[PDB]
Amino acid sequence: AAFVSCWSELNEDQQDELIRSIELALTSQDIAEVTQTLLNLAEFMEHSDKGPLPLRDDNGIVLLGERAAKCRAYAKALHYKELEFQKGPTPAILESLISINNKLQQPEAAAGVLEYAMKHFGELEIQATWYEKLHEWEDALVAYDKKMDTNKDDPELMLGRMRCLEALGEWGQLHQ
Amino acid sequence: VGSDPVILATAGYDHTVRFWQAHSGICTRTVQHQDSQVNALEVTPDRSMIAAAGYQHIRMYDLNSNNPNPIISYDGVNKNIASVGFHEDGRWMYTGGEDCTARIWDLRSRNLQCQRIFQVNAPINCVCLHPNQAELIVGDQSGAIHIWDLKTDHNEQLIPEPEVSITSAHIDPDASYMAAVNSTGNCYVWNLTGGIGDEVTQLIPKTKIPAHTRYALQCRFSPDSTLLATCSADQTCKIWRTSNFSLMTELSIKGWMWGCAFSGDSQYIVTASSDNLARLWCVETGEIKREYGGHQKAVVCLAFNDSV
Amino acid sequence: LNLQGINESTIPKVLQYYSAATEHDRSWYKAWHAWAVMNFEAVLHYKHQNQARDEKKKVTEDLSKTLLMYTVPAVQGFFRSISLSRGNNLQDTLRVLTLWFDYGHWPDVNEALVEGVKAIQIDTWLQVIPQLIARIDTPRPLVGRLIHQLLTDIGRYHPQALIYPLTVASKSTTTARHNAANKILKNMCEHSNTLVQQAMMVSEELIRVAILWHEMWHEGLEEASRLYFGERNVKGMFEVLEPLHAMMERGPQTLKETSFNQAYGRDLMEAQEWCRKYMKSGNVKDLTQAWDLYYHVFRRISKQLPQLTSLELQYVSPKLLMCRDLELAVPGTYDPNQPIIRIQSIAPSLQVITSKQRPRKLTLMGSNGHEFVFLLKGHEDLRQDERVMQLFGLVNTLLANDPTSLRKNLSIQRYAVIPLSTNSGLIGWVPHCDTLHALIRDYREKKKILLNIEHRIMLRMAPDYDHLTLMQKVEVFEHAVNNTAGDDLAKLLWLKSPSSEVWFDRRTNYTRSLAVMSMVGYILGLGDRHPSNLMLDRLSGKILHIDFGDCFEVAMTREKFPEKIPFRLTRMLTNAMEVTGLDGNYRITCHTVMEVLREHKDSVMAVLEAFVYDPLLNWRLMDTNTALNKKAIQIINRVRDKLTGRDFSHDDTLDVPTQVELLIKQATSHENLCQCYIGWCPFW
Ligand SMILES: Nc1nc2cc(-c3nn(Cc4ccc5c(c4)CCN(C(=O)CCO)C5)c4ncnc(N)c34)ccc2o1
């Protein structure tokens, strides 16, 4: 309330200085208390009619989500990432969406994300680790075998195939 | 209006029917059609008068006098009327109504009743006449085509693979092919018997063309049978050549594109769209040769009589 | 019973198998249940083999001889299976009742029923009381005696569970119903004799505050004028008016009744004299004179009415005011296990909600020490709601008894319904809820958006939207949709939350409840789901449906504006889900619920059959045309087709994943949505 009351009468030049100070604070420390206080302030300003805090020419969705991820407040991260998706989808946002949903005990949402990716981004943009994240150990094995066929011996694909085999329990092929 | 060797007209939601001169383009006369839209217009073979089909009634205006309001009216039907036709002798009129019935009317006999009726399942979209003027083709929303014989009174049925609405169909003037279009954008073509009348009607499908990616709204053959036009809701009008069924030209307006009419020699094309304007294009060059405007609302129906 | 089907060579084999299974271990419940159900099947197979063959002397006698060997084992097995359940046994009880009111007249089946009815507890009959009073006056002679005896026995103990429906039946136009009800009430009298009188007085007084003279007239005259002036129906006009003139004859018995009579009695009496002049003269001017007087009355009430905002009991019903410490339990609270709670007194004032129907807001003070609020409706039949609530309870139990559904908290929200007559009733009051219409109206007025923006755009584009053809309508619908944003509900739901970690749970609950009630409503045939017929909680997001008048595809066959939709699924509802779309919680929850329903088809088909075969309600179906047995058979066949997957082509048999997809495709179509009545809001 004090912040809102003060901010309303400030001059355009004093507001930018305060915003710069807040940005410096958000980046600098990992203090759990300061970060939580500033996140709560941002949320409160969002709910009001004065408009959200204008941080860094973007309203700070990226920075706020990144900082909320470390603070272990996953709902805020999901909200900010969902705003990011609406501005524009890219194959890099879907992976973060899947991971955040997994951290929140919601497999069905991740399955829906994969279905959307399948419908809207063809095949070349699909990676074999997304299946691993969803515990679909058979499609991951199929994709890894297909990849290892074309490409030569690369350690990462071999490790991924071994990891996929371990979960199912195929001791024979794994030992071979 | 009727003095010129070409008559052109268009209509839509604004309750007005307007006539245009093709050579340079300017309005010459307007008629009022209050209380409903217009679904189709047609000029009689006698080159005198015109018929407009709308909601629950069919009205006829005159071309030679240019003074008078409706001369003949047909009223007392249910729902919309989707099509209108005429016999080359100018004695019978065929209509495929919305309420699942096709009807025949007599022009000179002023008894307000249809001579013959023929009922089918699902509403009717399009009706067409065989060149011999002895058979009738009917399409319905259920995805089925019906063939009806006027002299023997028996009918037969057909159904392509999809159970989707048929939007239009037409038989070229020399009875060599017959084509139809469905709402999935696909078109189907069938070969026909050489002679017309007293024929087995050996309808065998040559092939289907995936002409469009959205709804198709009409299709017509050229008077010379060389070309086949196809409109659509994807702002594209495609022309195919009958010798090989391959694309020749593709006109675009990037509202939908509703109407389509050819010239007496397959030189021009006249098209209407939902953007309140009509366009006259050259078939070969594929460039807009002229434009007609003045309507306040969209234009849905068109008529072009290039004969005298 | 697979790879074979049902025949005349297979039935003996499987009966042998099940009999051996019962013999080897005479305590398993499943064995007896299966044996009884198998016997019940055989009987229904030899009937449709006769209707299909016989219809399309010795035959009937042979049928009597052959069919009198499957019914008695069925009854015995059903009774023994009931004995071993002691809990979820609704299906067996309904099956027993179905057999009873179809083959009781036969002598030996009556012997088996008489024997069985003694050995069962009396608590097994308290869940089928609504289905027993419907047949209180059966023509057959051997059924009514046993029904009366069982109803009397249900009266000695647990009497609080019989007074309301019996009182409702006691005041009926048909003579036999009220005769039987009065006989049973007489038999009950020597147990209490105060509870009965209190119940009758309370019911009479309540059925009266519900509708007042000015109101009955404000509508009677409306209806009578429509009949005469609109439809030229003089007979019908008189049939509305004659009863209203008669009623005032009884003579005022409360203050308000007298003041109407003082204001309008002379004018109405004179209007009747003009009508009676017409009866002798045949001169229509005399009816015109009467209508001049009736119109004068109608306008005065029309302007008097809108200012009635509350009612005081002292001018309406002093009888209720004098009531103190009754022995009658609060409506819709009796449970044979918990202690009883009685009504201490009634509050003195009633608040009238401002609407067309003008329902009241009654409140009672219980002996426990808490208030109970109710909604008192008049001019509305409320029995189809009772039946639907029983069905919803069954489905809730089915969902609760499964692990996958249990881990998700899938259920249906229900309320309390208590009929009082053929016209009025009581409904429980649900707190923290608001219709969608109200929420969108408030949001759009706060943000200053035109409330009819989409319709205004549609009309501007073409002012003939109601008469255009199909392809013409779809273009206009698409144009209207593409030039507007449909994110009001999502934005409103975000704003109305305190934090960001509560919004998540609320959204989850919203989605899952929507999916569950969509899947159930598809099978039930429910329709007429415009935005005013569903509400939304605040502390949670769970959705709630109401107004279950239409069922069994009644709205898909009407003549004007027939629906083409299985359930409501529009863009505003979809946008409020997760950003990706329908392929998340919604589709998987639909899969789960449809699987559960498909596993237990027998119970659902038991409940729905008893419901459709009740003669007091079949009126909802035959009215669709412009005999009834054939319609009931068709309805049940359609329900079976739905529950077996053979609902799009009788030749195929779809799996759940495939059917759900077809349903979702059918619901979200522009061709189907463009045809809806404009009051349905097909754009929200
Ligand atoms: N058959 C049948 N009706 C029912 C009504 C309720 C019910 N509804 N509401 C809100 C409410 C109450 C009254 C009105 C409206 C909304 C909308 C406007 N309106 C109109 O009359 C014009 C509208 O077109 C009056 C409740 N609030 C608390 N507890 C409840 N149980 C309810 C429940 C079950 C019902 O079952």
Residue numbers in the entry:
A (entry chain A): 1320 to 1495
B (entry chain C): 8 to 261, 271 to 324
C (entry chain A): 1759 to 1814, 1867 to 2436, 2492 to 2549
Quote from the publication.
Rapamycin and a structurally related immuno-suppressive natural product FK-506 (tacrolimus) 2(16,17) bind to a family of FK binding proteins (FKBP), which catalyze cis–trans isomerization of proline amide bonds found in peptides. The most abundant FKBP in the cytoplasm is a 12 kDa protein termed FKBP12.21 FK-506 bound to FKPB12 mediates immunosuppressive activity by binding to calcineurin and preventing translocation of Nuclear factor of activated T-cells (NFAT) into the nucleus. Thereafter, independent studies identified a mammalian homologue of TOR.25−27 In time, this homologue became known as mammalian Target of Rapamycin (mTOR) or, more recently, mechanistic Target of Rapamycin. As previously outlined, mTORC1 associates with auxiliary protein Raptor (149 kDa) while mTORC2 associates with the auxiliary proteins Rictor (192 kDa) and Sin1. To address these limitations, we have developed a novel class of “bi-steric inhibitors” that interact with both the orthosteric and the allosteric binding sites in order to deepen the inhibition of mTORC1 while also preserving selectivity for mTORC1 over mTORC2.
